[PDB]
Amino acid sequence: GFRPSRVVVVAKTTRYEFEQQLKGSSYSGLLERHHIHTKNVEHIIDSLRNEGIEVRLVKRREYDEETVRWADAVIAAGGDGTMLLAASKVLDRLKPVIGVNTDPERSEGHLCLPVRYTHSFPEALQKFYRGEFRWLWRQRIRLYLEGTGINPVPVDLHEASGPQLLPVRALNEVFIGESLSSRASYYEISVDDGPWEKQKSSGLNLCTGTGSKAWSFNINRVATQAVEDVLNIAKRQGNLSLPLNRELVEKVTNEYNESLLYSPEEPKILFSIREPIANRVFSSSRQRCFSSKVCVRSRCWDACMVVDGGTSFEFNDGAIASMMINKEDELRTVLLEQ
Amino acid sequence: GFRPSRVVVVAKTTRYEFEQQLKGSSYSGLLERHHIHTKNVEHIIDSLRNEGIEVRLVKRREYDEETVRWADAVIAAGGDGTMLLAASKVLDRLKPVIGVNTDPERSEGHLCLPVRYTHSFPEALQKFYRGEFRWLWRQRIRLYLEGTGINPVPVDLHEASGPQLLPVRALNEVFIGESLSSRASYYEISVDDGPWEKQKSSGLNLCTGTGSKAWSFNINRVATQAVEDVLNIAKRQGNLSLPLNRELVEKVTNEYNESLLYSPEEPKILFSIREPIANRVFSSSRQRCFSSKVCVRSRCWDACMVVDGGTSFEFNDGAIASMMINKEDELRTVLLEQ
Ligand SMILES: NC(=O)c1ccc[n+]([C@@H]2O[C@H](COP(=O)([O-])OP(=O)(O)OC[C@H]3O[C@@H](n4cnc5c(N)ncnc54)[C@H](OP(=O)(O)O)[C@@H]3O)[C@@H](O)[C@H]2O)c1
Ligand SMILES: NC(=O)c1ccc[n+]([C@@H]2O[C@H](COP(=O)([O-])OP(=O)(O)OC[C@H]3O[C@@H](n4cnc5c(N)ncnc54)[C@H](OP(=O)(O)O)[C@@H]3O)[C@@H](O)[C@H]2O)c1
Ligand SMILES: [Ca+2]
Ligand SMILES: [Ca+2]
Numbered sequence: 093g094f095r096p097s098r099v100v101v102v103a104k105t106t107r108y109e110f111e112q113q114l115k116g117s118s119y120s121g122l123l124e125r126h127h128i129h130t131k132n133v134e135h136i137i138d139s140l141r142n143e144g145i146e147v148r149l150v151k152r153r154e155y156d157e158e159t160v161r162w163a164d165a166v167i168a169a170g171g172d173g174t175m176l177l178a179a180s181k182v183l184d185r186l187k188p189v190i191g192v193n194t195d196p197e198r199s200e201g202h203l204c205l206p207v208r209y210t211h212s213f214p215e216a217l218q219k220f221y222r223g224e225f226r227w228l229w230r231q232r233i234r235l236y237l238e239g240t241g242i243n244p245v246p247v248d249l250h251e252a253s254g255p256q257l258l259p260v261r262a263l264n265e266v267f268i269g270e271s272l273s274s275r276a277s278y279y280e281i282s283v284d285d286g287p288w289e290k291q292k293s294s295g296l297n298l299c300t301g302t303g304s305k306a307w308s309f310n311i312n313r314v315a316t317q318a319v320e321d322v323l324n325i326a327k328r329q330g331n332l333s334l335p336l337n338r339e340l341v342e343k344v345t346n347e348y349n350e351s352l353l354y355s356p357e358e359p360k361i362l363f364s365i366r367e368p369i370a371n372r373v374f375s376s377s378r379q380r381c382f383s384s385k386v387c388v389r390s391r392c393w394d395a396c397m398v399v400d401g402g403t404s405f406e407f408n409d410g411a412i413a414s415m416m417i418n419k420e421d422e423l424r425t426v427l428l429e430q
Numbered sequence: 431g432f433r434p435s436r437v438v439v440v441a442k443t444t445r446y447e448f449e450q451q452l453k454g455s456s457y458s459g460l461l462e463r464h465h466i467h468t469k470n471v472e473h474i475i476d477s478l479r480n481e482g483i484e485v486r487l488v489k490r491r492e493y494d495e496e497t498v499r500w501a502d503a504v505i506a507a508g509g510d511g512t513m514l515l516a517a518s519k520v521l522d523r524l525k526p527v528i529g530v531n532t533d534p535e536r537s538e539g540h541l542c543l544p545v546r547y548t549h550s551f552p553e554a555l556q557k558f559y560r561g562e563f564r565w566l567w568r569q570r571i572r573l574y575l576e577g578t579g580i581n582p583v584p585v586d587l588h589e590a591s592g593p594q595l596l597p598v599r600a601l602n603e604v605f606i607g608e609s610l611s612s613r614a615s616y617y618e619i620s621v622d623d624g625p626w627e628k629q630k631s632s633g634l635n636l637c638t639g640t641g642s643k644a645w646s647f648n649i650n651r652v653a654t655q656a657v658e659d660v661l662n663i664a665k666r667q668g669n670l671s672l673p674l675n676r677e678l679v680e681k682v683t684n685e686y687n688e689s690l691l692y693s694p695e696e697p698k699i700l701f702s703i704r705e706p707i708a709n710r711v712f713s714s715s716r717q718r719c720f721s722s723k724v725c726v727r728s729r730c731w732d733a734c735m736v737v738d739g740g741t742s743f744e745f746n747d748g749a750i751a752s753m754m755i756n757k758e759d760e761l762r763t764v765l766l767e768q
Contacts (some may be wrong), residue, residue, distance in 0.1 A: 227567030
């Protein structure tokens with residue numbers, strides 16, 4: 093069983109708090125969105141204090157490493173974005189990090205406790221107390237940086253030198269690309285210490301098993317129409333039998349897309365070349381594959397390495413990044429029944 | 431036949447000229463890249479003057495509408511990027527625009543004359559003179575902007591109000607998305623005056639037939655591995671017969687990908703939702719389809735409408751853009767044998 097005496101709760105900033113800091117696309121829904129989150133944060137904190145747990149409630153600007161150190165456990169109160177924020181400042185594989193979905197009608201909360209615990213949190217505490225749960229260590233990617241002209245200083249997106257460790261780990265993915273959305277990205281890639289291979293594309297995505305359902309899923313999943321087309325082509329071009337139906341096309345589609353998801357516990361990186369350009373002057377290889385190690389040498393003008401959509405690093409011509417998975421970067425999370 | 435007496439040649443700026451305005455990723459190749467382009471520009475201009483044609487050679491900063499007006503024809507001397515630059519300032523469907531690939535080992539030049547004419551330009555002039563060619567009018571998209579808080583002023587990326595016409599046409603595509611590469615984009619889309627539909631994704635691409643081979647192709651094409659997987663799934667899940675082989679998988683792949691390309695002359699927009707997010711809180715519809723008309727209402731924080739990778743417009747919450755295809759926006763281009 094597991095009973096912290098000391099807990100920091102990191103709560104997301106709501107849209108309403110943002111504007112506080114009408115037209116027609118806000119206010120009415122926004123204030124109700126704010127009341128729901130606040131009602132649920134209060135339920136979490138009241139429930140913790142009723143178990144005798146000391147609690148510090150902070151917003152993003154006050155969530156710091158000192159407070160993580162003070163705490164026995166971190167609770168992210170918001171959505172998956174709030175889990176990523178919480179994980180960004182936890183580097184100890186023994187420190188539990190737990191997510192509570194505070195607006196389940198608008199937050200997916202895939203990294204969070206099942207939705208029932210949002211308004212039944214004492215039930216979650218008791219399940220923890222009795223050990224009716226399992227530890228889940230989610231693998232994360234660490235980033236090294238070397239080369240010429242490099243700038244290793246992290247930028248917080250929510251407002252010749254040897255390899256040095258960058259101060260965040262990726263729980264979802266590392267995205268590498270030019271800052272301008274229409275500017276093709278140019279680099280060289282070494283996978284598992286293999287040969288260097290020039291790529292031109294709209295960026296690279298390097299995700300964990302946790303991240304396999306996030307950005308990586310939407311880069312790689314095929315539409316049920318595309319599957320329907322591919323199958324119809326296979327009839328014309330060789331009468332590949334079968335009866336294609338509504339049911340079958342969805343099925344085969346779903347089987348393909350599940351192949352893109354893998355276990356959060358497996359220490360492997362799924363890397364995807366995002367929208368590669370082939371034609372007669374460039375040539376690309378595989379679109380995606382698993383690996384333990386990816387090294388990227390920047391050839392970019394004004395590009396960034398973005399960790400979990402939250403922390404950005406400069407990555408221009410001369411910079412060399414290496415990504416791997418290290419056991420000491422595992423993020424300690426919990427699994428409850430729903 | 432077709433014999434201009436007055437011609438403006440727009441020549442790209444080379445990398446060397448850029449730096450002029452070594453390590454290891456430049457110079458050696460860069461100066462040879464520069465000599466090749468310059469040698470070919472001189473051949474073009476010498477050939478024109480030898481036909482008695484008056485010629486003004488300009489770089490991007492001096493390419494203006496006045497000079498287009500002066501000219502009987504525009505020649506873009508570079509790659510497809512130089513064709514797009516040239517087309518950006520031509521709004522008259524009667525003014526010929528012709529592209530010459532000045533570095534065919536590094537420029538694809540899909541919008542340009544066949545590579546042989548790069549060093550055999552008098553042959554192209556004579557073919558023009560004798561009418562051994564066909565006019566190709568490439569359809570282009572025009573952009574209207576309305577709404578609240580809008581800013582219709584174009585930004586040149588290479589350094590309550592009613593609908594107003596934006597001053598460029600898209601020869602390849604209009605891209606719409608948030609400026610930050612990791613920030614999901616949010617908007618509502620009306621296709622052919624249909625119902626408004628909320629989307630969340632990494633942007634929208636709205637291309638012409640000319641643009642169908644560019645960005646749109648790499649957003650939508652499927653990998654030969656994915657086809658191989660989809661086919662193998664169809665065996666397991668219903669023994670859909672056939673013998674899958676190296677040959678067959680490439681074939682079916684190629685048939686699918688050709689379905690993404692359409693004629694530059696056809697007045698239809700192929701629009702693609704780029705990396706839509708579905709899950710349990712959002713829901714998307716079709717990934718791509720043809721249309722005559724797409725209206726997009728921005729819900730974005732800090733987004734842009736990017737025309738042919740060269741001209742950018744602000745497009746944040748309150749802005750409403752409508753895209754269509756108008757005959758007076760056709761771009762007059764030529765077709766030569768190779
Ligand atoms: N086109 C795309 O798919 C795209 C574009 C940009 C970013 N992203 C992803 O969004 C992450 C940043 O999340 P954010 O909440 O700060 O911004 P966000 O725009 O709210 O994220 C988009 C959605 O993905 C969900 N999500 C986040 N991490 C996930 C995971 N590991 N597995 C499954 N779903 C997940 C989020 O859930 P909640 O509703 O609980 O927030 C959200 O509904 C990034 O690391 C990136 O992976 C995806
Ligand atoms: N991931 C992607 O596929 C991606 C990302 C950004 C932009 N783009 C495309 O590139 C366009 C801007 O071109 P750029 O030359 O200024 O930058 P660029 O990075 O040099 O364009 C990428 C390549 O596409 C080729 N291309 C351009 N227009 C084409 C067309 N209509 N059909 C077939 N190929 C075409 C270019 O040919 P050249 O070698 O002759 O220049 C170039 O090789 C944009 O409108 C957009 O469509 C694609
Ligand atoms: Ca979120
Ligand atoms: Ca180019």
